[PDB]
Design a protein around this ligand. Structure first.
Ligand SMILES: Nc1ncnc2c1ncn2[C@@H]1O[C@H](COP(=O)(O)OP(=O)(O)O)[C@@H](O)[C@H]1O
Ligand SMILES: Nc1ncnc2c1ncn2[C@@H]1O[C@H](COP(=O)(O)OP(=O)(O)O)[C@@H](O)[C@H]1O
Ligand code: BEF
Ligand code: BEF
Ligand SMILES: [Mg+2]
Ligand SMILES: [Mg+2]
Ligand SMILES: [Zn+2]
Ligand SMILES: [Zn+2]
Lengths: 343, 369, 362, 369, 367
DNA sequence: TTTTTTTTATGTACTCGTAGTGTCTGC
DNA sequence: GCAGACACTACGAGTACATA
C-alpha cells in the first residue's frame, strides 16, 4: 500500500482516487482536515452518499447494508466512514472488517479513522487484504521541537505574521493540541484583520488548554525542565488522568535509571545501553540524567515513589498529585524534600 | 378569569378528541405543546393540537348554553376521561381560577391548565393552489406509496412524500435510495403543476384523518405549508426545503423482458422463501427461464430455500437478485390479481406494475449476492 | 412588590453590556460584520461567566431585522421576541434535560424545515456536555453537512467531556474568568443603576469572594441586600462572609505560623460552629503546608489550581524559613496520626495546633 | 441416519405444531435448547418440544409409507415454513446428509438438523394423582386468579400459584402480599388432600392448553412434576417447592360492614378515577355512607378526581384507602352482575366477592392510615 | 394528651421559636419584609440545627393568607396544612428517594402549572446533595430562570458535593451549630412545658453531650426521661452518658500529678465500684489534661459548665509546666492506643497510670 | 520516530437494544 | 380473531462515575 503524509495527501487525491483511504493518527486536526479534503474531492468527482459509521464494540454493525445494494434513485457513488476504537480493532472486529473488505463496489469509497495500529493489528487479515489498493495516511502530532515550523506553515496558510515570540507562546500554550492551535489561529485572524500578530495581542487572545501524555512528563523530569514538568502535572490533573498510569510510567524509567547508575561504575555506557534495550532517541537523555543525579537522589526518589504508591493503594488518599509534584522537585533539579517529602 | 363554559355530548366529542390527540405523547418539546388548546367562540368549539410542525383543528358545534373562552388542557387525560364516561353522558366543563372542572352527573374531575396566550399559534399564510379530491383517491394514493419512504435517511428530504400535481392528475412519489413507489390518479379538473414534499409525520396524519367516509377532501398548498379539510378537521403542516429527485429517469427506459404472475402466488412464494434468508441482509435470487421462475434463498449456516413457479415470460434467460423485504412489501401493497414485472439485466432497475392497470408503478434494484 | 432577582433582570442585551471577555466579543463582531461565520460555535467558560448570555446575544444579532450585524437594533419585533422566551426560529434546547436521543431527534429533524421568520434557524443547545453518545452521533451527522440556513450555538461548562470529533467541527470560544476589578466595576454599575447604597470596601469584599464569576457576585449582592436592611454596609458583608467562610485552612495556618493563640482558638471555634470533618481539615492543612514547602523550592510549584489564594500563599512562602515549615508539617502529621484516638476530634486537633504553636515563638 | 419419508397433511400438522411451539420462544440459553423433535413410530408422529423444565408432546396419525425415526428441527423456521402453504397440501420431509428436505408441490427447502440424542428429556414420576375436569371449568378457575400471582419477586415462590385438593373440591390461590385471590369449586371425585405450587410459566402454558368444550382434561399431579392430557396433546412441567401463607388467615373473619353494588358501574367508576390517580401510587380513598360510595383520587399535579356511586350500604363512614390497579383487575375478572364489598376496619383489609356466588373471593390490603 | 417524641412535637412553628441562627432568621425575615424573594435557597450546616424547619417556616411565610409576611400570622388556613404536612402546594421531595434523573424530569415537566391554592409552589428538596449528577444538570436551567410562581428550597448537610454551577445561582444560607447555652436554655423551656422536674447540672450535661445540634439534644433528653422515672436527674444523666461529672477525673489527675499512687489506685477501685467503662475514664482524663493545656495557653478558656471546678483548674494552670502537660497527654494517648490490647481494660488503665507515674519528670518512682 | 498504559471491591446511574405483554383496531 | 401493530414495560449491557 501507499504510506503517506498529510502534506502530500492533496497530490495523492489529485492524481486519482484509490479504492479506500485509511487515515490514521493520534491528532484530531490533521485527521479532520484529511477527511474533509477526501470528502470534498470525492464530491467533486461524483461521490454524494456519505455515511458516518462508528465501529466501537456496541450494538452498531450493519455497514454491509449500504454496500450490497445499488442506488435506485441515481447512480450516486457512496462514501463509508469507520471510527476505529481507542485501541484499534479486536480479533472479532478484525474478521468483521475482513468480511467488509471481502466485497467492495468500485464506486464505493471507504474511509477509516482511528489511532495508530501496532503490528498486532497491522498483520491482521483485514489490513493485509487492504494492503493492495488502499492508501494509508499517517497524521501525528509534531514534537515540541517540531511545532514552530508547523505553526509557521499554518500562519503562511492564512497569510499571517507572528515573528518568533508569538510562535513560542502559542507552542507552549497549545502544546500537544493542534486542534485548539488551529482554532486559535483562526480566532486571531478574526480578531485582527491586519493579520500582523504580535505578542501584545496573542498574549491575551490565547488559552492554557494543553494536552499531554505521561511520557512527556517523564522526559521533562529527565531533562530537568522544572517548569515544563510542573506544567504537565497540572495539565494532567485538570485532564483527570489516572495517577496510577503516571506512577507506572515514571517507575519504569526510574528503575532503569537506578540499574544504570548501579552498573555505571563498572561498565561503559555504550555496552550498558545495548544490554538494557534502550531506545536510540533516549540514549543522550539517559546520559544526561546519569551524569546529573547520584544514587542518593535516586534512592530518595524511590522511597518517595514507594510512599506515594502505598498511600495510593492503601489509605485511598488524595495527596497523590502534590506528592508527584514533590517527586518532580526531587528528581533531576534540586533535591531537598527533607523528610517533609521524603517519608 | 375566563369562564369558558362547555355543555356537550360524549359522542359529539369522542371522535374529534381521538383525532386531535393522536401525535401528542411522550415528553413534548414544550409543556404547552403537550396540551390541547380548547377555544370556545360564538357557538362553536375549536380543539387545536400541534407539534411545532403541524396543527390539527377540530370544530364542534354547540347548542347548549356556553360562554367564550380559551385554555389549554392535558391531552391524554382529557381523552381518557372523555372515553371513560358512560355512553350518552353529558359533559360540562368550567374553567375556575387556574383549574378546569369536568363534570358528569355523578363525577367531578379537576385538571391542571395553561393559559391560551402562551400557546404557539402557528403562522398563517396564503395558499398558492387549491385542490379537491374524493377521500378514496387520497386513501389509495397514501396506501400505494407511504411504505416506500425513507426512514431516517441522511439526505433529510427523502424522509417524506412528493406530491406532484400536473395537468389534471396527481402523483405521489416515495423513495429510500433503493426503492421507488409512484402512484398517479385522476382528479377530474385541470390543475397548476406543483412539486411539494410532505414530511413523514404529515403523511401519517393525513392517512389517519381520512375518516373513510364520503365527503370531499379540500387541500390548500402554499409556498411552505399544506392544509387539508375533511368535515370539521383542518390539518396544516410545514414542508421540506429539499428538491425531490426526478422519478421519471429511475424507471427502466427500455424494459427488455416482460413477465406476468399471480400476485398472491408470487407473494406467498416470496414469503415462504423469506424464512430461510440471511438475517444479516435478507435477499433471494431469481432464475427466470422459459415460462419458469425459481427462487433461491441462502443463509450462512448453510440453509437453502428453493421455489419453482410457472409464470408467463417473454425472454431468453435471466439471473437477478432481490432484497426479499422490498419485493414482499411491494407485492403486499399491490393488492391486485396479477403482477407484471419488467426486467432489463442483473445491474439495472426492475419495474413492478399491475397486470391490468397502470396507475401505480414501483421500481426496485437488484441486490448483489 | 415583584423585585426581580439581580441574576435575571441584569442579563446583558447588547454586546456593549458584556463585561470583559473582549477576546470573544471582538471576534464575534468581526465575524458577523464580515462574511466569515462558522457553522457551529462552541462556548466555554467557568461557572457563570457569560456563556449563555453571549450565546443569546449572538442569536439576537444573527436574526435582527436590520441584518446580520455586531449590534442588534433592539427595537424590531425579532429583538423584542427573542428578548422574551417566545420565538420560533431560535430554539432553546435544555440539552441537560433532553439528553436521550429520542428527544434530540424530534428537534434535530427541524433543520430540514425552513426558518419561519429570520434568516437563520439558530439552535441554542445549552449544557451540551450532557448528551448521550447516540445523541452526539445524531448531532454530528447533522453538523457534517449542515444546511446553509442553520447555525448551531453550543454552551457548556466542561468542553473536554465532548467527544473529539464533534469538537473538531466547532469554533470554540473559551471565556476567561472575570477579574476582580471588572467584577467590582460591574457591581458598582448594577448597584448605582438601582436604589442600593453601598460602601466601596463592601464591594471589594464581594468581588474578592465572588471567585471571578458575575452570577456568584450578584447572588452574594442580593443576599447582602437582604441581610443588610436595604443598604450594603461593610460590616454586614464581612459578617455574612464570616458565616460563609470556607478557607479556614489558610487563615488558620497564617495564625499558627504567626503564633496568635487567641486567633487559632477563635478560628477553631468558628470551624466548629460549621460542621467540618476534622480529619479533612487537618489533611488539607497538611496539603497547604506541603505546597508551601514546594514553593520554597521553586516559584513555579504553585500552579493554576490556587490562583484565588496565590498572593497570600506566596507571602507565606516568602516570609517563613523552610525549616519551620518542615517542623510544622512533622508535628501536624504526627498529630493527625494520633487524631482519631484523642478525646474528641475537635479536642485532638486543638492540642495538635497547640503543640505546633508552642515551638519557635513563645 | 435413516431416510424419513414422512408425509404429513397440513391440516393435521399446523395446530399441533403451534401447540408444541408455544412454550419455546425468545433467545434460548444455549443452542439446541430451542428446537423440536419429530419422531415417527408405527404410523404415529409425535412432535415434542422442551425448555428443560417443560415438555410438549403432540400425536398425529399417518397413513403414508414411512420409517420409524426421530429427528430434530429448529422450531420457528419449521413453523413458519409449514404455514402459508396452499391448503390441503401434503408435506414430505426426508433426511439426507445431516439435513432435512421438506417438499410441498414444487417447493423444496433444506434445514440444518441435530441428532435426536441431543434432545434432552425431563424427569419421570409415577403414581400421579389423576383428575378429570372440564376445560372451561379450570379455565375460569385459573382466570379468576391469573393476575393475582406476583411476577419476579424474591419472597417465597410467588412466581406461581397454589392448587389445594381437599375432599371433593379443588381450590386455587394466588397472592402478592398485598392482594390475594382464592377460587374453590367442587370437582366430583374422591380426592386426597394435597397442596402444590405450579410456576407462572406453567400457568400460562396451562391456559394455552385449553381448547374446546369437548373431551375433558386429565391432570396428573405429583410433587415435582405436573402433567395435562387434552386429547392427543400431552403437557408436562416442573413444580416449585415451598408453600404459600395460610389463605384462611388472610381472609378477614369479621365482614361486619357490607356493601352491594353493580359490577359494571363500579368498574367504570374505578376506571374513571384511576386516570387522575398517582402514576406510581395508584391509590384512591373511599368514603362509605348509607347507599353511597365516594371515591377520591389525587396526584402530584393535584388534579383531584371525585366520583360517587349508588350502593346498598348501612353503617358509618370508613374512609378506606387502597390501590386502584388491584381493584380494577379484580372487577375485570369478576364479570358478574353484582359485587359485595366487605369492610372490617379503617386499618383492616377489604374483601371482594361475587354477590350471587361464593366460588371466588379476593382480599386487598389498604394503602395508608 | 398522648406522648409523642420531642423532636417532632416541638418543631418550631414560627420565626420567634427558632433559637440561635440569628443571621439566617434576620436575613430571611428582612428579605420577606422588603419583598425581595430569591427563587432558590440553599440551607447548609451540620445535622439538626434547623435547616428543614427553617425552610418549612419560609414556606409558611411565603404562602400565608394575609400576603407575603415575614412573621407567619399565627395559624391561618394556608398554614394549617403546612403544620399538618398535607399542604397542596408545598411539595416535599425526599431527594434521596428520587435521585434518578427520570424523576427530576417529571418534576420539571409540571413546573409551569399554576399553584392550586398558594401563591408559590414551594419545592422543598430535602437532602439536595443526593441527586444524581444528571438530575443536577437537569435542574440547572429551571433554577436559572424559573417561572414567577415557583420557588426552590434546598436543604443539605455538606454543600461541597453539589456542583458549583448550582451553588452559583442560589442563595447560600449557612446555619452554624448552636452554642451550649442555646441548647441548655431551649431544653429548660422544653422540660418546663412538659411539667417535668429537672436538675440544672443534668441539663448542662445534656447540652454538652449533643454537639451543637438540637434534635440530637432532644433525643438524648427523651432517652434520659426514659432512663429516669419520667424525671431528668443528675444521676440518670451521668448513667446514660457514661461521663464522670467534673470531680472524679479531676481527683485522678490531681493525684497523678502529685505522684501519689495510693490515692490513684484507691479511686480506680472506687470507679470500678461505680461500674463505669474504663475507656470513658481515660477519655475524661485526657479531656481534663487538654482543658488544663487550654487554660495555660489562653488565660480565659473555661466555659460555664466547668465553673464548679474552675478554681482547681487554675491551680494546675499555675503549678504544672506545659511540657509536663504535653508529656502526660501523649502518655495517656498511647495508653488509649494500647488499652484494647491489654490483658484487661482495668489492667491496661492501671498500667497506663503507672506508666505516667514512673516517667513523672518531677517525682518519678524510685529505682 | 516509538512503543510504550493501571489497583479493587462495591455500589449507583443512564442510555440504548431487544423481548414479553396488552390491547385495539381495521383487520 | 387475530395477528399485528404498535405501545409499553422490563432487562442486559455498555459505560461513567463515586467511595473507600
Ligand atoms: N459579561 C457579562 N456581563 C454582564 N453580566 C454578566 C456577564 N456574565 C455573567 N453575567 C451575569 O450573570 C448572570 C447569568 O449569566 P449567564 O450568562 O447565564 O452565565 P453562563 O455563562 O454560566 O450561562 C447574568 O444574568 C448576568 O447578570
Ligand atoms: N434552630 C432551632 N430551633 C429550635 N429547634 C430546633 C432548631 N434546630 C433543630 N431543632 C429541633 O430539631 C428538630 C428537627 O430539626 P430539623 O430542622 O429537622 O434539623 P435538620 O436541619 O437536620 O433537618 C426540630 O423539631 C426542633 O425541635
Ligand atoms: F449558566 Be452557566 F454555564 F453557569
Ligand atoms: F435534616 Be437533619 F440532618 F436531621
Ligand atoms: Mg449557562
Ligand atoms: Mg431534614
Ligand atoms: Zn432588531
Ligand atoms: Zn399563616
Amino acid at each position: 500500500m501507499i504510506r503517506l503524509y498529510p502534506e502530500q495527501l492533496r497530490a495523492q487525491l489529485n492524481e486519482g482516487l484509490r479504492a479506500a483511504y485509511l487515515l490514521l493518527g493520534n491528532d484530531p486536526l490533521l485527521l479532520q482536515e484529511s477527511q474533509d479534503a477526501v470528502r470534498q474531492v470525492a464530491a467533486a468527482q461524483g461521490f454524494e452518499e456519505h455515511h458516518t459509521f462508528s465501529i466501537d464494540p456496541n450494538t452498531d454493525w450493519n455497514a454491509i447494508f449500504s454496500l450490497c445494494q445499488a442506488m435506485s434513485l441515481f447512480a450516486s457513488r457512496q462514501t463509508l466512514l469507520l471510527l476505529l476504537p481507542e485501541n484499534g480493532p479486536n480479533a472479532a472486529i478484525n474478521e468483521q472488517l475482513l468480511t467488509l473488505t471481502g466485497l467492495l463496489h468500485d464506486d464505493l469509497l471507504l474511509i477509516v479513522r482511528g489511532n495508530k495500529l501496532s503490528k498486532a493489528q497491522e498483520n491482521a487479515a483485514w489490513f493485509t487484504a487492504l494492503a493492495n489498493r488502499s492508501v494509508q495516511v499517517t497524521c501525528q502530532t509534531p514534537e515540541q521541537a517540531q511545532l514552530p515550523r508547523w505553526v509557521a506553515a499554518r500562519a503562511k496558510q492564512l497569510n499571517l505574521e507572528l515573528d518568533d515570540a508569538a510562535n513560542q507562546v502559542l507552542c507552549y500554550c497549545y502544546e500537544g493540541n493542534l486542534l485548539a492551535l488551529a482554532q486559535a489561529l483562526e480566532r486571531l485572524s478574526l480578531l485582527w484583520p491586519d493579520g500582523k500578530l504580535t505578542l501584545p495581542r496573542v498574549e491575551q487572545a490565547v488559552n492554557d488548554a494543553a494536552h499531554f501524555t505521561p511520557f512527556h512528563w517523564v522526559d521533562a523530569l529527565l531533562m530537568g525542565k522544572s517548569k515544563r514538568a510542573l506544567h504537565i502535572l497540572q495539565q494532567l490533573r485538570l485532564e483527570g488522568s489516572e495517577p496510577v498510569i503516571l506512577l507506572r510510567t515514571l517507575q519504569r524509567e526510574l528503575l532503569l535509571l537506578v540499574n544504570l547508575k548501579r552498573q555505571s561504575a563498572h561498565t561503559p555506557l555504550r555496552a550498558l545501553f545495548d544490554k538494557h534495550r534502550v531506545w536510540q532517541n533516549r540514549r543522550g537523555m539517559m546520559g544526561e540524567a546519569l551524569n546529573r543525579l547520584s544514587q542518593t537522589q535516586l534512592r530518595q526518589a524511590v522511597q518517595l515513589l514507594t510512599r506515594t504508591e502505598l498511600t495510593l493503594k492503601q489509605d485511598y488518599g488524595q495527596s497523590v498529585w502534590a506528592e508527584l509534584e514533590g517527586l518532580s522537585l526531587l528528581l533531576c533539579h534540586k533535591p531537598l524534600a527533607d523528610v517533609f517529602i521524603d517519608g | 378569569g375566563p369562564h369558558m363554559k362547555f355543555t356537550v355530548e360524549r359522542e359529539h366529542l369522542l371522535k374529534p378528541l381521538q383525532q386531535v390527540s393522536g401525535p401528542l405523547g411522550g415528553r413534548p418539546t414544550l409543556p404547552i405543546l403537550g396540551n390541547l388548546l380548547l377555544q370556545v367562540a360564538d357557538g362553536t368549539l375549536s380543539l387545536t393540537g400541534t407539534d411545532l410542525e403541524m396543527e390539527m383543528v377540530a370544530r364542534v358545534a354547540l347548542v347548549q348554553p356556553h360562554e367564550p373562552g380559551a385554555t389549554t388542557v392535558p391531552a391524554r387525560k382529557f381523552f381518557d376521561i372523555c372515553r371513560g364516561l358512560p355512553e350518552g353522558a353529558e359533559i360540562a366543563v368550567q374553567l375556575e381560577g387556574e383549574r378546569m372542572l369536568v363534570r358528569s352527573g355523578r363525577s367531578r374531575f379537576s385538571l391542571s391548565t395553561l393559559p391560551a396566550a402562551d400557546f404557539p399559534n402557528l403562522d398563517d399564510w396564503q395558499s398558492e393552489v387549491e385542490f379537491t379530491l374524493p377521500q378514496a383517491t387520497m386513501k389509495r394514493l397514501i396506501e400505494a406509496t407511504q411504505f416506500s419512504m425513507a426512514h431516517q435517511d441522511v439526505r433529510y428530504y427523502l424522509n417524506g412524500m412528493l406530491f406532484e400535481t400536473e395537468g389534471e392528475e396527481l402523483r405521489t412519489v416515495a423513495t429510500d435510495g433503493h426503492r421507488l413507489a409512484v402512484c398517479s390518479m385522476p382528479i377530474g379538473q385541470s390543475l397548476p403543476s406543483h412539486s411539494v414534499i410532505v414530511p413523514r409525520k404529515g403523511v401519517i396524519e393525513l392517512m389517519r384523518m381520512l375518516d373513510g367516509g364520503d365527503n370531499p377532501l379540500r387541500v390548500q398548498i402554499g409556498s411552505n405549508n399544506i392544509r387539508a379539510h375533511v368535515g370539521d378537521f383542518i390539518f396544516t403542516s410545514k414542508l421540506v426545503d429539499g428538491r425531490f429527485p426526478d422519478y421519471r429517469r429511475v424507471l427502466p427506459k427500455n424494459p427488455d423482458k416482460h413477465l406476468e404472475a399471480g400476485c398472491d402466488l408470487l407473494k406467498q412464494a416470496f414469503a415462504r422463501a423469506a424464512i430461510l434468508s440471511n438475517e444479516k441482509f435478507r435477499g433471494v435470487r431469481l432464475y427466470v427461464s422459459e415460462n419458469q421462475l425459481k427462487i433461491t434463498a441462502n443463509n450462512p449456516e448453510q440453509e437453502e430455500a428453493e421455489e419453482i413457479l410457472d409464470v408467463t415470460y417473454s425472454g431468453a434467460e435471466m439471473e437477478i437478485g432481490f432484497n426479499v423485504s422490498y419485493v414482499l412489501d411491494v407485492l403486499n401493497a399491490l393488492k391486485c390479481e396479477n403482477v407484471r414485472m419488467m426486467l432489463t439485466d442483473s445491474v439495472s432497475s426492475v419495474q413492478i406494475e399491475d397486470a391490468a392497470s397502470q396507475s401505480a408503478a414501483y421500481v426496485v434494484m437488484p441486490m448483489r449476492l | 412588590m415583584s423585585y426581580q432577582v439581580l441574576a435575571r433582570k441584569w442579563r446583558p442585551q447588547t454586546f456593549a453590556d458584556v463585561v470583559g471577555q473582549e477576546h470573544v466579543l471582538t471576534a464575534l463582531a468581526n465575524g458577523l460584520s464580515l462574511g466569515r461565520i462558522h457553522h457551529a460555535y462552541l462556548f466555554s467558560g467557568t461557572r457563570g461567566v457569560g456563556k449563555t448570555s453571549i450565546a443569546r446575544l449572538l442569536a439576537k444579532g444573527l436574526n435582527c431585522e436590520t441584518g446580520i450585524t455586531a449590534t442588534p437594533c433592539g427595537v424590531c419585533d425579532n429583538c423584542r421576541e427573542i428578548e422574551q422566551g417566545r420565538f420560533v426560529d431560535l430554539i432553546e434546547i435544555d440539552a441537560a434535560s433532553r439528553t436521550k436521543v429520542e428527544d434530540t431527534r424530534d428537534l434535530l429533524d427541524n433543520v430540514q424545515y425552513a426558518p419561519a421568520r429570520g434568516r437563520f434557524k439558530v439552535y441554542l443547545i445549552d449544557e451540551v456536555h450532557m448528551l448521550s453518545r447516540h445523541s452526539f452521533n445524531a448531532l454530528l451527522k447533522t453538523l457534517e453537512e449542515p444546511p446553509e440556513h442553520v447555525k448551531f450555538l453550543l454552551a457548556t461548562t466542561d468542553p473536554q467531556k465532548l467527544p473529539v470529533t464533534i469538537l473538531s467541527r466547532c469554533l470554540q470560544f473559551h471565556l476567561k474568568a472575570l477579574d476582580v476589578e471588572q467584577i467590582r466595576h460591574q457591581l458598582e454599575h448594577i448597584l448605582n443603576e438601582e436604589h442600593i447604597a453601598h460602601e466601596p470596601r463592601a464591594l471589594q469584599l464581594l468581588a474578592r469572594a465572588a471567585e471571578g464569576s458575575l452570577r456568584d457576585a450578584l447572588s452574594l449582592t442580593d443576599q447582602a441586600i437582604a441581610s443588610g436592611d436595604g443598604q450594603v454596609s461593610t460590616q454586614a458583608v464581612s459578617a455574612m462572609l464570616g458565616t460563609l467562610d470556607d478557607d479556614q485552612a489558610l487563615s488558620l495556618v497564617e495564625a499558627m505560623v504567626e503564633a496568635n493563640g487567641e486567633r487559632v482558638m477563635a478560628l477553631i471555634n468558628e470551624a466548629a460552629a460549621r460542621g467540618i470533618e476534622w480529619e479533612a481539615l487537618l489533611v488539607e492543612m497538611l496539603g497547604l503546608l506541603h505546597r508551601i514547602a514546594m514553593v520554597q523550592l521553586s516559584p513555579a510549584a504553585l500552579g493554576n489550581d490556587m490562583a484565588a489564594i496565590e498572593l497570600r500563599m506566596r507571602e507565606l512562602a516568602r516570609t517563613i524559613p523552610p525549616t519551620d515549615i518542615q517542623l510544622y508539617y512533622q508535628t501536624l502529621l504526627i498529630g493527625r496520626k494520633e487524631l482519631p484516638y484523642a478525646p474528641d476530634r475537635r479536642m485532638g486537633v486543638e492540642m495538635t495546633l497547640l503543640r505546633a504553636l508552642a515551638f519557635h515563638p513563645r
